[PDB]
Structure formats: C-alpha cells, structure tokens
Amino acid sequence: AVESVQCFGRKKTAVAVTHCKRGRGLIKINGVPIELVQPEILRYKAFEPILLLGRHRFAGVDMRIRVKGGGHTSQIYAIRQSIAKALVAFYQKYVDEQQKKEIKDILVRYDRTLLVADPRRCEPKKFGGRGARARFQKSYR
C-alpha cells in the first residue's frame, strides 16, 4: 500500500496541491526543484516551512507540488501553505502524534498562515464608480 498524502494551500485564487510520500527528501514544483522558484525574492517565503523545521525532517518524504491560478505571490504563498499542511498530515498519519504536534506548534508559532488559509477575496465593484468603494469624481458647477 502506497504511503502518501495530498494537502492543498490557498491564497486568493491560487490553489497548490502537494503530493507527499515516502522518499529520499526531494521537493519539486511542476517538476522543477524548489530552489529555482520564481520570483527569486519570494524564495524566502517558499523556504520558510523548511527553514523552521530544518532539512532533516524532510529527509524521508518526496514532495511533488502542482500549483494553479492566482498570481506570482499568491502561488508562492499557496505552495508554502500546502507544503506545511502536507508535512503535518504525513507526520500525523505515518509518524508518532507527538512529533506531529511538535512540528505543528513550531509552524504555528512563526506564522499562522502556514496552515490556515487567508479568507480575503476581491470585493465586487458597484456601479457609480470604478472600484468597490471609489466613486466617480463629483462636480457641482
């Protein structure tokens, strides 16, 4: 029986799904190593789940991540959230609950968005203005 889990991260319209299973500890997104993710500035956000838990805890799981929708920042945030959730679920289901709780606490203490999706969404625009709140310029004379 295959030992794998599939957890998804969300940010705006971006949806990333991480396939975590027993392996030698490779992390790739769309077949590309996680070290080459773009933009280069957001590599820190991408690697945050790994820099807090260290590379060793990922040494026994192969992670394959597929992302879709959203934009360049939303996709990165969704990817990191999916990685965190997938690792937590894998530790919960195939590793001692004590270690799963430890890693979950470590992840949450740094940033709660690593496991809980941000619910913010675009506000629909209303007639009488260009934006959701912004109204057309008013003139009196």
Partner 1 sequence: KVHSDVMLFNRWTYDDVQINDISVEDYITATASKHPVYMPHTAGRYQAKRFRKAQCPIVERLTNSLMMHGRNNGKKLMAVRIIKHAMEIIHLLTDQNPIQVIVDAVINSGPREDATRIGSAGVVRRQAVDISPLRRVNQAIYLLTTGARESAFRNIKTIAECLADELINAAKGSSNSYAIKKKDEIERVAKANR
Partner 2 sequence: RTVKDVSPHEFVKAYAAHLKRSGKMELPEWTDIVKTGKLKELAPYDPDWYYIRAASMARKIYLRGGLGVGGFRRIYGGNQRNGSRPRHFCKSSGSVARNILQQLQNMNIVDFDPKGGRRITSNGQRDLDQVAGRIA
**Which positions lie near partner 1, rule CB under 8 A?**
39, 41-42, 44-45, 47-48, 51, 73, 77, 110-111, 113, 118, 120
Contact between 12 and RNA per CB under 7 A: yes
CA angle in degrees (0–180, nearest 5) for 14-20-23: 145
How many amino acids of this chain bind Mg ion (CB under 5 A)? 1
Considering only residues 22 through 51, tell me which ones interact with RNA, judged by CB under 7 A. Answer: 23, 26, 28, 30-31, 38-41
Of the candidates 116, 95, 106, the one whose C-alpha atom is nearest the C-alpha of residue 20 is 95
As given in the structure block, the two tokens for residue 93 are: 């289901």
11 within 8 A of 117, measured Cβ to Cβ? yes
Contact between 136 and Mg ion per CB under 5 A: yes
Query: Rounded to whole angstroms, how far apart are CA atoms 141 and 125?
Result: 27
Residue nearest to Mg ion as judged by C-beta position: 136
Contact between 71 and RNA per CB under 7 A: yes
19 within 8 A of 9, measured Cβ to Cβ? no
Which span sits near partner 2 by CB under 8 A: 28-36, 60-68, 70-78, 119-127?
28-36
